[PDB]
Structure formats: C-alpha cells, structure tokens
C-alpha cells in the first residue's frame, strides 16, 4: 500500500469520466494491492488551445 501511482487522463465528456474510474478499479480488483494502488485523476476539455497546455501542466 505505501507505493501509490498516479495515472492521469484527459477525456471528452463527464459521463465517460465515471466509466474511466470504474475501469481502473477493475485493474485493482484482479492484480493486487500491496505495491500498486493505481490512483486515477482526470480533467475535461477546453476550447482555448493554449489553455489546454496551461491546464495540463498545472493540474496533471
């Protein structure tokens, strides 16, 4: 458990958000929980091009 990896993501719609979360949970339901515990965070899209780079940097 002390090791905790932090896979991010950038999806399209908020609903797919939920899907993503459930998916990663399966990746822990089958593989183990000692040196692992993948933790999933994400963000949603923006239209201001440079705002994409700024947001991805600052958040992810």
């Amino acid at each position: 458990d002390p090791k905790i990896v932090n896979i991010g993501a950038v999806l399209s719609t908020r609903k797919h958000e939920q899907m993503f979360r459930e998916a990663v949970n399966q990746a822990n339901k089958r593989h183990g929980s000692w040196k692992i515990q993948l933790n999933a965070t994400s963000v949603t899209h923006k239209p201001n091009a440079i705002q994409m780079a700024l947001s991805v940097c600052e958040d992810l």
Binding site: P47, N48, A49, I50, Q51
Partner: protein
C-alpha cells in the same frame, strides 16, 4: 546575430509597408477567449524570403531554415581540444590543408610504419604532370 535578426525584421516590415499601407495588429489576448481566422492575407510570411542585409544573403527556404549557413568543420587536436579548419561561404570547401596531416590516433597505438613520402622530378618520359 542579434543585430542581423533585428535588421531582418525591420527590413521585412518596411517591405510589407511599402507593398501597401496596412500595418498588422497584434493579437487581442492569448489568455483570453477563443480565436478565429481573420487575417485578410498573410501579414509578413511571404515578406520573409529574398531579403538581403549588407552582403549577408540569408534566404530562409520554404522548409524554414537558412539557405547559406555558416558551417565550419572541426577536428580534435592533439591536446583534447576542438580545433577549426575550413569554412563554407558560398559553395566551396575552402579547405585549410593541402595534404591531410597524419594524426596520432592514440597515445597507446602502433606507430605509423607504412607511409613513405616518395619524391620525383619532372622529366619527359618518366613523369608527366
């Protein structure tokens, strides 16, 4: 280099203004709202090629680099330092050694014992230059 670049930009702006008196306005705000194409024509992109500056003939290609780079070939010296030999101005190598000096490859290497500096004299039937 800095002075040359500023001169390039100034000359391009002057040529663009001389083509027609319509100065290009800077963008509103990168941090602001979205952007849409609104340039009536390419402001100064076509005004970048075919530009001279007091002999320097920098002529950036369509790919996007200089067509007359200042390239100089260098060779490691006998004291582990980079030397300099030969420029490249228009098209010529303009090499700075008529005969390549046989350089010591290493401090621990076999001696050069297979090179003989032969000599001759110009005669009629023996050697013809």
């Amino acid at each position: 280099r800095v002075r040359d670049g500023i001169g390039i930009l100034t000359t391009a702006a002057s040529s663009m203004l001389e083509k027609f008196s319509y100065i290009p306005e800077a963008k509103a705000s990168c941090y602001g709202q979205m952007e849409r194409p609104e340039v009536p024509m390419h402001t100064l992109h076509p005004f970048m090629v075919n530009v001279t500056w007091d002999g320097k003939d920098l002529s950036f290609t369509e790919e996007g680099y200089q067509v007359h780079p200042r390239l100089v070939v260098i060779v490691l010296n006998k004291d582990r330092e980079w030397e300099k030999v030969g420029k490249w101005e228009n098209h010529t190598l303009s090499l700075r050694h008529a005969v390549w000096p046989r350089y010591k490859s290493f401090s621990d290497c076999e001696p050069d014992d297979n090179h003989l500096s032969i000599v001759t004299l110009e005669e009629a039937p023996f050697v013809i230059v």
